[PDB]
Write a protein that binds this DNA or RNA. Structure first.
Lengths: 166, 61, 834, 846, 44
RNA sequence: CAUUGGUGAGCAGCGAAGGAUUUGGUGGAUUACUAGCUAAUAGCAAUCUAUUUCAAAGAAUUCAAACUUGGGGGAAUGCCUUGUUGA
């Protein structure tokens, strides 16, 4: 432990990720285990891709993509020290943010990294997606939420939300 | 096989000189090849000596 | 003889944790691994505590009375120690990892920062006896959201200031009645708050952050409340504040950064008094003594300790230790100094009485593998892996000659003849032994005839015959002096790893791979003895081992052995967790010493807790460095399969417990071991045991004092030797008059005369009675010099100790006196007019 | 009954004494407080882990315990103590002279019932108080009202009412007003126990003839009667898991579970606790749990759990029997023998008269474990034999343990009562080993010993033979035949060279072991009962029938000490690890500590119970004693670890200072004519001589980055004549410079540099002349010789130019002349040093 | 350096006479052991 | 003849209402004993949340922020930087 949890958009599959490298994908309502990995490494977050068939894990340095059974398909060298993972299900974009202060959009269908955006605000404390328009809301330690689009290098909106870190 | 060699290393059968090496990632120099040998009191070493009928139990095999 | 107690941990000054001054300002306490070392900087006297934590120490504190020491390791396990008695009073387990421990200025209470919580406990009375639970909880305060970085008592014990990782500092009151005066949370910081301090009076509060901001809080009007009056910033951009301390009477703020930089500031003016750099590694701890003259900075990487006087820009102390890095040690021919060779290429000279390094030699460009002295104490020789053997004068600190083969080969063992003309070295790359002359740097010879790598070399101190032995299971004895040049080989069953010469030079002892120590005679190549040492060895199980420590064969042998100077015992060590002492005529084990009890080391436990083993594997092998706060902590710079690592490439596996070199002291009944934690010095004190010699019913201390009053001085001295008690021997020895000294010294029995020589040698170096001790030495040398001359090896330790007394103090006194006399003669005899 | 050396620390190996334990709840956590003599111990229930021990022993035994919400109430004699975390917050002494029997805490009230049928009610002064502290009232139960009080209970939702269960009937009191509200009809049988049910108004009564009666207090009737024939009911409990189960604990040692809904008997656990010590003294179901905690008088505390049913549809009908979850235990009888199992004082070995050998941890009571007596298979393949109904080994009368070969083979030998063989044990596996060592002369084993190498074991036989076996292979090596009576002690030295035996014939035999010769015999006046050998000092002590302890040096084979003063049989004795002391316990209820250098009795203890075994820790920090009564080992701490003790004899009252405290302070000066140095550090002379270059080394290489403007007198913000110069002037006036020399000694080296360098260098050179005269008188003193020489050297460095340009001045010349006169006598030190180096070098090298 | 870290048996260190007193050549600590200046008489 | 070959059939010996292998589960120990929860100078443990909100305090890089990149060549369009044009 501790375990960071994620649900499929259907909600039929659950993806748990321990801090000490125990990452499991299961059909929680059936009680059927799809995959189980013991990475023996620090793991921070995981997300499902367009199905339960593929999932991404943000490990100690690099982000890895595994299939349904649990074999490693990809090791994304460009995504470094990501703590927050997200998936835009209509754009097929996996979005990573983390300790480096860079927001990265990667196309999971073609494999081409779509965008590298420099947040310039230190490590990203929080990250959410707007499901309405696929704009990423990042939370920084200066107390501002910034709104990001892959086609623009600067944030669309900066909101001064909190005094301390968000 | 290399996998057999990996398992024999982790199981404590291999020494490079007097020193036991249980790390498979250990890199061997051309000079250091000449001292990569079975550890004494190894069941593998006893097996090969017993196969050749040359096992001496005074030497511990 | 057999009894040895752990005296010193030499060669390390700071591992990690809090360093604390004593209240009088004379003693510095520093954590070295799981042990605490105290250095007395005024009396130049260092000792270490015998007790061990099971892991590395995270915090220590000493009482203001100097009577109690509380030391907490990582994972929160405390030991409470009687400081003056040097004995452990209690063991406590605080279940959470503790950041700070601090006694009250009264000393009645102590505060502890464990997690979010602040625990105040009542300090037990030191004059009370040991009881089952001596700690009474005063309070537990739980206002912080995250882990407490630090805590500070006020000068009166009423208030405590706590700083935590949730970017705030709280004020707490010891009294529930006074809790209304202390209910404030101080906010506004953008990072971890590193310290909160009161002014010299209670009215001002200073809070310091990780990103480098100092806030001054005052209780002022805009009713009345605390507010930030003034914000000051350190503009060190890359460096983050690693530590901070504050002396309120001097108003001195000392800050240590991640860049290796420490700054001295004066508050509340924020005036930069000073700005210096320890090095490149972070400054991990800062302390200041009570009167405020001395600051002490500790850096964990490379193990650097630094006591700085700051009013005068002067370094009281600048030391660097060596952890998991020592390959060889050699005593000086007087046992006052130990010289260590290190894997980073440094040769260091450590005083034994004060635990500090005297000199460092850095000409070697790779790991130094061996260090030896000549019979003359002024020359040492060192062999390194870089391909050179160097000779050092310790008078000028001069590398006066270097020795190089034809090609570059990695020298691993080193020997030098007694009359210092010939130096031999052996290598693992080559099967030959390279022989150089000292006066001329050219190589005389390359001895051939070993079918494996020459693992060990020695010169006989009297015959001047060279015994080498190798991994080809042979010991070759070379007579390289003379016209003959004959070599005689001896075959052993197994691979020879260590070798030692008897000080007589008649016999050679050999430690092999099969766990045996075999002793051979040199004149006829006959095996006169054998010791089976394999079962005595304590071998642990590593966290990565898939095989039992019983079935492991990593360390079931000894890689270093050494003879006692009387030739009767052998100390032995290896890559194990045991140091074994043997009596060679009886071929039996006298005593065994556990090298380390540190679970942070690897092979210290034979069995491992099976709760750690999961279906993934060990929980101790999970790569958890990614959870760290800093990128420098998170970065994995390692190369795959490196056996030891490097300065820039740190190894993945934990350090292993091992002893690389054991030696006996030429001067005292002590031995040194070069191990992972440092230099283990085990010594014998005769004040502890009761060991009578030729005792009788009539022989009592009362009877000895009665004979002293009856003025039967020879009888009193003989009875004191028969009782063998240091205080009573000292009493009689100082009670004998000067006129009676020749008669008593002439009539001392021949059996007790090693005892009186050993006593005088031990006593005379610290005692102030220089003329009395010299008269005793003169009387004993006049009476029985011939007996000593016949029994060289029985008397060698005592005579070397006496010579150390005569050279080390008496010559300095005489030199000062003669310089005064000649200066007086000049100043009076010569005219200085106009 | 006190000592200057040893203080009581704890008594280990004890779990409960058969006083009914109390259960307490903190949140979701349960704890059990058991009574151990005069202390109590608290255990975390989930792990059975010892949390707290009562801090101080009560004057009398604890008779009743109760617990509620961080507070423990313990009854002894007329007092009730209120403790939190083992520390006594409050004490109530009742005005009666009688003894408190029972306790009941509910609401504001504490009710304490005495043996003369009186109930003292105490109440809180303020309802916010944590415990009742002040006396409210007293209620007497007369013989016409009811018999002797059995229990005080409080049913739930009974406002201000206490239920007093007697042997005859059940009474109900209003503890606020003191009225007797209700009195039940008399029961034919004597009521032994009572327990409130988790239903409303119902209390369960257990009688002597074996009846469990459910009594409705509001109805005033009985609603159910359960009969358990030929059983005395000792405990009652109710399940609160949702299953209507009742547990009855009998004095025969059985625990019976009944289903109250089904009207049936679920299960019987037979002999969970021994009948002789009282059977099931207490059994409590934990609240809401399928776990029942049981205890008895046999020093055990067990737990049992109910598994869920194997049937899904049936469930409550098909109930699995309760199974053993976890327990803590100790000896059921006082320990016969003890030893320390290692040098770290982690573990002790203890054999008791209940035939059990245990290992007790001094660091954590959970690590204590009983050594297993499960035998091994014989090597030949034949059957072992013996009765199939397995019983424990006979009680151990002797034990030897050597950890030189722990983990390789057997390292313990035990001699058992009335057997002709000794048994071996392995401490790593914690089990009996595979060899039994015989005496081979048809005699009982009187002595066991082991070699320090771990390869040999020695047996002393009641017929005089000594057999040496191999510990690894169990093979008889040798047999020694000197003695003709019972061999009551064997030992061997640490070098395995010399061996000593002692026996009932009064003979001490000295043997060599490498060569099988006999080195000597020694006849003493009385038969020898026991021997303790000290291997560092080669000294062994013998207990003799004439009530003396004889210390013999083994290398010279000579009686060196004889200790007299025990007025009865010496039960045990042991050495200190440094060999300085011997601690002996005798049948005269005394434990004496003897100093061997003086041969005196330095300490004595008058004990209440005779100490059968005395052992002393290898660390020297602890002493362990076992006594005739009590199932535990008493641990004592050594005050000599932290303070120094006088060796002055203490046998005068019941049962110079340098010699007494084994210290000696070296004199400041042995003689006036002897040159002596300073008392301080040796490096002060060197620092004073070369202090400037030490400064230049100590300065940093680069100038530190300072502020642009540093404030003046920053150290100050953070008279006409110096005290040194005043002392110099008055010393010149009075011709005595002693105080001046004293302050020069006590100055720091930098202060010495200042006060020497800042002298009056001008005419008439009075300060220089006076300083030279002070140094001459200091040189006459023959003390601090190197310091006065250093002071003159510093003067020559500082003001040498003044003295040189201004010599042939009368005052300066005469001062230096006096200095030369006193200083020329110190060439004797040169001659001594030169002789010592020349002769010592010649002797050493040639 | 990195190749030595890979293949070297021991720990790999990172890759890096005027007239003076020898007490100045020592390390910073209260004591000293050698007094004579660095230059030999033949070197002076 | 040898069998330090396999598979068996039988003796002597050992030998207390059996013995010998194998295996699933659970408990204790595997570091040295100061009790559970919370918003913690106290309260709870049957919770409260029908006082849980006010006041006070609290905003530096004037966003400094990839110390995080396998090698060699490149960069239409991106991105970064600098200059410039028009507002």
């Amino acid at each position: 432990g501790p375990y960071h949890i994620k649900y499929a958009k259907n909600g039929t599959h659950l993806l748990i990720t321990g801090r000490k490298g125990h990452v499991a994908s299961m059909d929680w309502r059936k009680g059927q285990l799809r995959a189980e990995l013991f990475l023996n490494e620090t793991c921070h977050s995981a997300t499902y891709l367009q199905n339960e068939q593929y999932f991404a894990v943000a490990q100690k340095k690099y982000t890895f993509i595994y299939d349904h059974e649990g074999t490693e398909l990809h090791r994304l060298k460009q995504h470094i020290e990501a703590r927050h993972l997200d998936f835009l299900p209509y754009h097929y974009l996996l979005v990573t943010a983390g300790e480096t202060g860079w927001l990265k959009y990667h196309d999971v269908s073609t494999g081409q990294l779509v965008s590298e955006l420099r947040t310039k605000a230190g490590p990203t404390m929080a990250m959410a997606q707007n499901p309405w328009n696929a704009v990423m809301h990042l939370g920084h330690s200066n107390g501002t939420v910034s709104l990001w689009s892959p086609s623009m290098p600067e944030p669309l909106v900066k909101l001064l939300s909190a005094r301390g870190p968000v | 096989t290399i996998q057999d060699a990996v398992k024999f290393i982790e199981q404590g059968h291999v020494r490079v000189g007097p020193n036991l090496i249980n790390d498979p990632a250990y890199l061997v120099t051309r000079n250091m090849e000449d001292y990569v040998t079975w550890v004494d009191n190894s069941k593998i070493k006893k097996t090969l000596l017993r196969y050749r009928n040359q096992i001496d139990d005074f030497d511990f095999s | 003889k057999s009894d040895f107690k752990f005296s010193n941990l030499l060669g390390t000054v700071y591992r990690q944790g809090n360093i604390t001054f004593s209240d009088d300002g004379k003693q510095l306490l520093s954590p070295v691994g799981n042990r605490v070392s105290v250095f007395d900087l005024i009396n130049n006297k260092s000792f270490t505590f015998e007790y061990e934590h099971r892991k590395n120490i995270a915090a220590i504190d000493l009482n203001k009375q100097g009577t109690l020491l509380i030391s907490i390791d990582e994972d929160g396990r405390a030991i409470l120690v009687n400081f003056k008695a040097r004995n452990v009073l209690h063991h406590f387990n605080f279940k959470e990892k503790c950041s700070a421990v601090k006694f009250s200025p009264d000393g009645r209470l102590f505060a502890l920062a464990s997690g979010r919580f602040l625990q105040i406990w009542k300090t037990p009375d030191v004059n009370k006896d040991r009881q089952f639970a001596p700690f009474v909880r005063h309070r537990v305060h739980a206002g912080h959201f995250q882990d407490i970085t630090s805590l500070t008592w006020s000068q009166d014990s009423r208030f405590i200031l706590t700083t935590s990782k949730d970017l705030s500092a709280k004020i707490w009151s010891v009294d529930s009645e006074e809790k209304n005066l202390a209910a404030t949370t101080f906010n506004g910081h953008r990072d971890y708050v590193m310290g909160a301090f009161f002014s010299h009076d209670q009215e001002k509060i200073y809070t310091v952050s990780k990103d480098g901001a100092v806030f001054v809080w005052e209780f002022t009007k805009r009713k009345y409340s605390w507010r930030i009056t003034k914000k000051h910033f350190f503009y060190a951009n890359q460096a983050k504040v690693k530590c901070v301390t504050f002396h309120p009477a001097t108003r001195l703020l000392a800050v240590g950064f991640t860049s290796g930089e420490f700054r001295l500031y004066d508050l509340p003016d924020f005036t930069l008094i000073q700005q210096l750099s320890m090095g490149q590694n972070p400054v991990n701890t800062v302390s200041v003594n009570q009167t405020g003259e001395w600051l002490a900075f500790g850096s964990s990487k490379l193990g650097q300790l630094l006591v700085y006087e700051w009013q005068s820009e002067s370094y009281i102390l600048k030391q660097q230790g060596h952890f998991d890095s020592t390959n060889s040690l050699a005593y000086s021919p007087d046992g006052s100094r130990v010289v260590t060779a290190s894997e980073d290429g440094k040769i260091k000279v450590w005083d034994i009485t004060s635990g500090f390094c005297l000199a460092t030699f850095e000409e070697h460009t790779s790991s130094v593998t061996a260090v030896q002295f000549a019979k003359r104490g002024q020359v040492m020789f060192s062999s390194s892996l870089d391909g050179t053997v160097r000779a050092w004068d310790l008078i000028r600190y001069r590398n006066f000659r270097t020795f190089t083969g034809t090609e570059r080969i990695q020298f691993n063992c080193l020997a030098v003849d007694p009359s210092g003309e010939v130096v031999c070295a052996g290598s693992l790359d080559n099967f030959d032994i390279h022989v150089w002359s000292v006066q001329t740097g050219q190589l005389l010879d390359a001895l051939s005839g070993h079918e494996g790598p020459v693992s060990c070399l020695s010169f006989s101190q009297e015959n001047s015959v060279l015994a080498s032995a190798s991994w080809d299971k042979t010991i070759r004895i070379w007579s390289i002096f003379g016209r003959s040049q004959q070599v005689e080989p001896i075959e052993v069953y197994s691979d020879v790893l260590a070798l030692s010469m008897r000080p007589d030079g008649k016999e050679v002892a050999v430690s092999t791979l099969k766990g045996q120590i075999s002793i051979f005679n040199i004149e006829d190549a006959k095996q006169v003895g054998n010791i089976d040492c394999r079962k005595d060895i304590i071998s642990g199980r590593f966290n990565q081992d898939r095989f039992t420590a019983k079935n492991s064969e990593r360390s079931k042998f000894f890689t270093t052995i050494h003879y006692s100077f009387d030739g009767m015992a052998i100390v032995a060590g290896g890559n194990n967790n045991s140091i074994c002492l043997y009596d060679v005529p009886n071929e039996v084990l006298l005593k065994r010493f556990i090298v380390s009890r540190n679970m942070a080391l690897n092979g210290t436990l034979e069995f491992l807790n099976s709760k750690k083993m999961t279906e993934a594997g060990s929980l101790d092998l999970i790569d958890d460095a990614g959870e760290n706060s800093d990128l420098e902590d998170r970065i994995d710079n390692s190369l795959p399969g490196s056996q030891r690592g490097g300065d820039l490439s740190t190894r993945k596996m934990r350090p292993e417990v091992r002893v690389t070199s054991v030696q006996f002291s030429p001067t005292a009944n002590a031995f040194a071991a070069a191990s992972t934690e440092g230099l283990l010095i085990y010594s014998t004190n005769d004040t502890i045991l009761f060991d009578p010699f030729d005792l009788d019913v009539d022989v009592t201390p009362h009877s000895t004092v009665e004979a002293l009053r009856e003025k039967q001085f020879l009888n009193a001295l003989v009875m004191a030797f028969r009782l063998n008690e240091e205080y009573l021997i000292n009493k009689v020895y100082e009670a004998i008059p000067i006129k009676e000294i020749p008669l008593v010294a002439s009539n001392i029995p021949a059996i007790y005369l090693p005892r009186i020589l050993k006593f005088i040698g031990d006593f005379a170096i610290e005692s102030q009675h220089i003329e009395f001790n010299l008269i005793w030495i003169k009387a004993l040398l006049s009476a029985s010099g011939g007996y000593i001359n016949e029994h060289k090896y029985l008397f060698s330790t005592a005579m070397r100790s006496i010579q150390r007394f005569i050279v080390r103090v008496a010559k300095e006194v005489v030199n000062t006196t003669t310089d005064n006399k000649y200066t007086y003669r000049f100043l009076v005899s010569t005219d200085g007019s106009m | 009954k006190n000592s200057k050396i040893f203080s009581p620390f704890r008594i280990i190996g004890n779990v409960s004494n058969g006083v009914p334990f109390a259960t307490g709840t903190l949140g979701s956590t349960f704890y059990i407080v058991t009574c151990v003599g005069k202390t109590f111990q608290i255990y975390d229930a989930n792990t059975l882990h010892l949390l707290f021990v009562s801090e101080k022993e009560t004057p009398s035994s604890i008779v009743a315990l109760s617990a509620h919400f961080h507070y423990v109430y313990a009854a002894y004699e007329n007092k009730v103590g209120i403790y939190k975390r083992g520390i006594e917050e409050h004490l109530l002494e009742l005005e009666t002279d009688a003894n408190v029997e029972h306790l009941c805490i509910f609401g504001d009230y504490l009710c304490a019932s005495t043996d003369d049928n009186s109930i003292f009610i105490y109440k809180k002064s303020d309802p916010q108080d944590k415990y009742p502290s002040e006396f409210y009232t007293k209620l007497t139960v007369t013989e016409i009202q009811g018999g002797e009080i059995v229990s005080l209970q409080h049913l739930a939702t009974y406002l201000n009412k206490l239920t007093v269960v007697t042997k005859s009937n059940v009474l109900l009191f209003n503890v606020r007003t003191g009225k007797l509200v209700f009195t039940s009809n008399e029961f034919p049988d004597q009521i032994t126990t009572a327990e409130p049910a988790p239903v409303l108004d119902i209390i369960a009564l257990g009688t002597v003839t074996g009846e469990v009666i459910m009594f409705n207090m509001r109805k005033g009737k009985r609603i159910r009667t359960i009969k358990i024939p030929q059983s005395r009911i000792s405990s009652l409990s109710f399940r609160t898991d949702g299953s209507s189960h009742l547990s009855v604990g009998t004095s025969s040692g059985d625990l019976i579970f009944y289903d109250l809904d089904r009207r049936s008997r679920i299960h019987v656990l037979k002999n969970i606790h021994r009948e002789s010590y009282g059977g099931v003294t207490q059994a409590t179901f934990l609240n809401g749990q399928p776990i029942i905690v049981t205890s008895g008088g046999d020093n055990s505390l067990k737990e049992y759990v109910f598994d869920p049913s194997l049937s899904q549809g049936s469930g409550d009908v098909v109930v699995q029997p309760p199974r053993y979850l976890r327990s803590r235990g100790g000896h059921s009888q006082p320990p016969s023998y003890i030893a320390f199992a290692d040098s770290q004082s982690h573990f002790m070995l203890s054999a008791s008269k209940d035939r059990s050998l245990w290992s007790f941890s001094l660091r954590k009571d959970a690590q204590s474990q009983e050594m297993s007596q499960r035998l091994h298979k014989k090597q030949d393949g034949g059957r072992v034999g013996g009765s199939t109904i397995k019983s424990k080994f006979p009680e151990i009368v002797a034990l030897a343990i050597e950890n030189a070969r722990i983990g390789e083979w057997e390292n313990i030998i035990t001699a058992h009562k009335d057997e002709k063989f000794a048994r071996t044990w392995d401490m790593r596996n914690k089990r009996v080993g595979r060899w039994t060592f015989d005496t081979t002369d048809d005699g009982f084993v009187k002595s066991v010993a082991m070699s320090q190498c771990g390869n040999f074991g020695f047996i002393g036989s009641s017929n005089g033979s000594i057999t040496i076996y191999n510990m690894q292979s169990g093979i008889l090596r040798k047999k020694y035949k000197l003695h003709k009576r019972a061999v009551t002690g064997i030992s061997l030295d640490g070098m395995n060279r010399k061996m000593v035996s002692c026996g009932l014939d009064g003979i001490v035999g000295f043997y060599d072991f490498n060569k099988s010769t006999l080195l000597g015999k020694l006849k003493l006046d009385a038969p020898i009962t026991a021997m303790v050998y000290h291997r560092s000092s080669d000294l062994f002590a013998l207990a003799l029938d004439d009530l003396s302890i004889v210390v013999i040096d083994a290398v010279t084979q000579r009686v060196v000490r004889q200790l007299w003063g025990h007025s009865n049989r010496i039960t045990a004795f042991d050495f200190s690890p440094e060999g300085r002391w011997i601690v002996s316990a005798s049948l005269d209820s005394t434990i004496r500590t003897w100093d061997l250098p003086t041969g005196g009795c330095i300490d004595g203890i008058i004990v209440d119970n005779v100490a059968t075994n005395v052992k002393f820790s290898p660390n020297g920090d602890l002493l362990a004693t076992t006594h005739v009564t009590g199932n535990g080992i008493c641990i004592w701490t050594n005050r000599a670890q932290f303070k120094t003790v006088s060796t002055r004899t203490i046998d005068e009252s019941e049962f110079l200072n340098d010699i007494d405290f084994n210290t000696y302070t070296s004199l400041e000066q042995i003689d006036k004519e002897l040159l002596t140095l300073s008392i301080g550090p040796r490096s002060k002379m060197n620092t004073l001589l070369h202090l400037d270059v030490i400064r230049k080394r100590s300065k940093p290489k680069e100038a530190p980055k300072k502020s642009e403007k540093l404030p003046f007198f920053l150290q100050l913000s953070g008279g006409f004549e110096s005290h040194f110069t005043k002392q110099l002037r008055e010393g010149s006036q009075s011709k005595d410079y002693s105080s001046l020399l004293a302050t020069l000694i006590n100055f720091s080296p930098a202060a010495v540099d200042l006060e020497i360098r800042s002298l009056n260098s001008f005419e008439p050179f009075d300060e220089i002349v006076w300083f030279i005269d002070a140094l001459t008188q200091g040189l006459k003193s023959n003390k601090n010789f190197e310091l006065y020489e250093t002071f003159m050297s510093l003067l020559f460095k500082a003001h040498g130019d003044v003295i040189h340009a201004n010599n042939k001045n009368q005052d300066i010349a005469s001062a230096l002349q006096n200095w030369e006169d006193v200083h020329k006598k110190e060439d004797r030190l040169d001659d001594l040093v030169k002789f010592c180096m020349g002769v010592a070098a010649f002797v050493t090298t040639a | 350096y990195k190749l030595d870290v890979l293949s070297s048996v021991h720990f790999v260190p990172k890759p890096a006479r005027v007239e003076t007193p020898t007490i100045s050549m020592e390390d910073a600590q209260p004591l000293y052991m050698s007094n004579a200046s660095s230059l030999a008489p033949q070197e002076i």
